[PDB]
Structure formats: structure tokens, C-alpha cells
Amino acid sequence: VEFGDPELTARINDAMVQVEELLHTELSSGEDFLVDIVMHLTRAGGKRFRPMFALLASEFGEKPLSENVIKAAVVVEITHLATLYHDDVMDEASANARWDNSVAILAGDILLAHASGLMSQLGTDTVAHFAETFGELVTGQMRETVGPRDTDPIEHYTNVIREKTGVLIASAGYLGAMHAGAAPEHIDALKNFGAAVGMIFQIVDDIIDIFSETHTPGTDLREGVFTLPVLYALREDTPVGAELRDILTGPLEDDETVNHVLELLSQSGGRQAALDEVYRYMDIANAELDRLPDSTVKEALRNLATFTVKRVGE
């Protein structure tokens, strides 16, 4: 990406190239018929936020951007891609679709095999950390799939994001810093910062989905997914809260009902409630950066979080 420091920008950009090379090698490893399938399902790329965060984190150690830092970053990104493959097959909830599903399940699995190969060269602490991280991630997908049962819907939603999204970003910071040989306190801070940042990104995304116009809103609503601002509004002891409770159980479908709900939400206190929750995570993020030495990298991380927050408020 682009930071204040142009010296930083260049170092990082060079490392991102090394990450992309090793990643491509792994995605294209194996028997022809299998590689063909993986390459056809290749997502067409991404922002690579997770490996970049791992690279930034490594700047706090004695060996920034070293070969094992690049390898850890690739492990994190491979894991990310594997989960997308498995998540996509489940978003699907005749025989040319049952084939498509087998294929993506196996693509996700071969990716995990590749990731494990690299982790074997990174050490058992990485494997242990990965096992916990991937377990959490899978727990988040299961949690989302089963729903809130009879728990508080806001706690459920928070848990789903912490697990499905937060932990892997926390892991990028952890592994980036650890394989750079950073101090334990700094490793821990970057891990915690990643977790807080994961919460910020998702809640901000959810706010935008409901309250913004153009770069149509209400995507989550149509699918029947009620995110933080909606959950807060449904809680209110007001006429708007009451009307939202009475509508948001029945048939979700026609555009007119969706647009009425969207207006109700704009009349509710849900946006600001979600935004205050974003601010609380930003306070957490800032407290973690507090544990790190002042530097342009620290400020680049702070800005990553702050810029996201500013998409929805100040």
C-alpha cells in the first residue's frame, strides 16, 4: 500500500512481491488436474490485507521481512483462501453443482495441506498457534451456521466476527512479529491490535451496508442477516424499535419493505450505537499500539484503523 514513509512503502512492496511469488508457487503445486481446478477457482486475487499486516508487524522485530516472515504471511493468506472456498460452498445453502461443491471443498483442503507444509518449516509454535487460530475460525463459521440459539443476539454477532474474522488478522500480527524476532510484549500487542482491527473493519462494513448510498444498501437485510446497527435498533423501547420488531420476523423480500426498514433504521439510534462500539474497539486498538515503540510503522497501523473509522464518523 502507500504510507507516509516512502522508505517503508518500498520495503513492504518488495516483500509483498515475495509473498505473491511463494503464494503462487503453492497454489500451483500438485498434479496437473488439481492445479487446473485451483487456478480456475482462484479468487482473482484480493487486497492481501492479511499478509501486508504480517509484514508491517515484522518491522518491530530484529529481522523484518525475513524469509520466514514471508513464509508466515503466505501461510496466513493460504488459510484465508481455504476458508473462503469452504465458506463459498456453504453460502450455497444439480449434478453440475454437486461437482462444483466437491471441487471447492477439495481445493480448500489441498490449500490446508500446502499451508501445513510451510508451517513444518516454521516450527511447532507456529503449528500450535495455527491450530488454535484455524479452530477458532471454523468455530465462527459453525456459530454463524447454527445461529444465536437462545443467547443475546449482540453477543452472538460479536462472537461470530471475533472468530470468523478477527482471529486470523490477529494471527497475521502474531506470526509477522514472532518470526521477525520481536519482543514478546510487542508480539502480543500486534496480535491484540489485529483482533481489534478485525472488529472495526467488519462493523464499519456493516454500518456502510445499511446507511450508505453509492460508492444499493440493505444486502445483509435481504439475506435475513441482522448486523449490529439493526440488533441495537431492535432493542430500543421506542416506536421505531417496536415497529422494527414487528416487521423483522415476517416475509423478507419485496423492495418496498426493505426500503421502509432502511428508513426506520435511519430514524433509530442503531447507527450511533454501532459507531460507539467501533470507537470502543478503536480505543482498544490505540491501547495496543501504546505498547509499541513510536515509529512510522506504528503510525501507519494507527492510520489503517483511523481511516477505516472515518468512513463512518469522527
The annotation places the binding site for Ca(2+) at: 87, 91, 263, 266
Sites of contact with Ca ion (CB under 5 A): 87, 91, 205, 209, 266
User: Given the complex with Ca ion, which of 124 and 214 has the nearer CB atom?
Assistant: 214
Instruction: Say if residues 57 and 295 touch (Cβ distance below 8 Å).
Output: no
| Residue 169 binds ligand DMA (CB under 6 A) | no
Which among Ca ion, a second copy, ligand DMA, none contacts residue 247 (Cβ within 5 to 8 A by kind)? none
Instruction: Say if residues 195 and 170 touch (Cβ distance below 8 Å).
Output: yes
Site for ligand DMA in 90-149 (CB under 6 A): 91
Give the DSSP letter of residue 62: S
- How many residues bind a second copy (CB under 8 A)? The answer is 47
Instruction: Say if residues 181 and 152 touch (Cβ distance below 8 Å).
Output: no
| Residue 98 binds a second copy (CB under 8 A) | yes
Instruction: Say if residues 70 and 18 touch (Cβ distance below 8 Å).
Output: yes
Distance CA 57, CA 186 (A): 9
Site for a second copy in 51-80 (CB under 8 A): none
Residue with cell 505473491: 20
DSSP string, 109-175: HHHHHHHHHHHHHH-HHHHHHHHHHHHHHHHHHHHHHH--TTS-HHHHHHHHHIIIIIHHHHHHHHH
Closest C-alpha among 79, 87, 165 to residue 129: 79
Greatest extent of the chain over all pairs of C-alpha atoms, in Å: 62
Which among a second copy, ligand DMA, Ca ion, none contacts residue 116 (Cβ within 5 to 8 A by kind)? a second copy
| Residue 124 binds a second copy (CB under 8 A) | yes
Q: CB of 87: closest distance to Ca ion in angstroms?
A: 4
Which among Ca ion, ligand DMA, a second copy, none contacts residue 266 (Cβ within 5 to 8 A by kind)? Ca ion
Site for a second copy in 282-311 (CB under 8 A): none
Cell of 158: 460479536
Cell of 282: 478503536
User: Given the complex with ligand DMA, which of 144 and 277 has the nearer CB atom?
Assistant: 144
Q: CB of 155: closest distance to a second copy in angstroms?
A: 13
| Residue 231 binds a second copy (CB under 8 A) | no
Name the residues that contact ligand DMA, by CB under 6 A: 83-84, 87, 91, 164-165
Name the residues that contact a second copy, by CB under 8 A: 30-31, 33-34, 37, 86, 89-90, 92-93, 95, 97-99, 101-103, 105-106, 109-110, 112-114, 116-117, 119-121, 123-125, 127-128, 130-132, 134-135, 138-139, 141-143, 145-146, 149
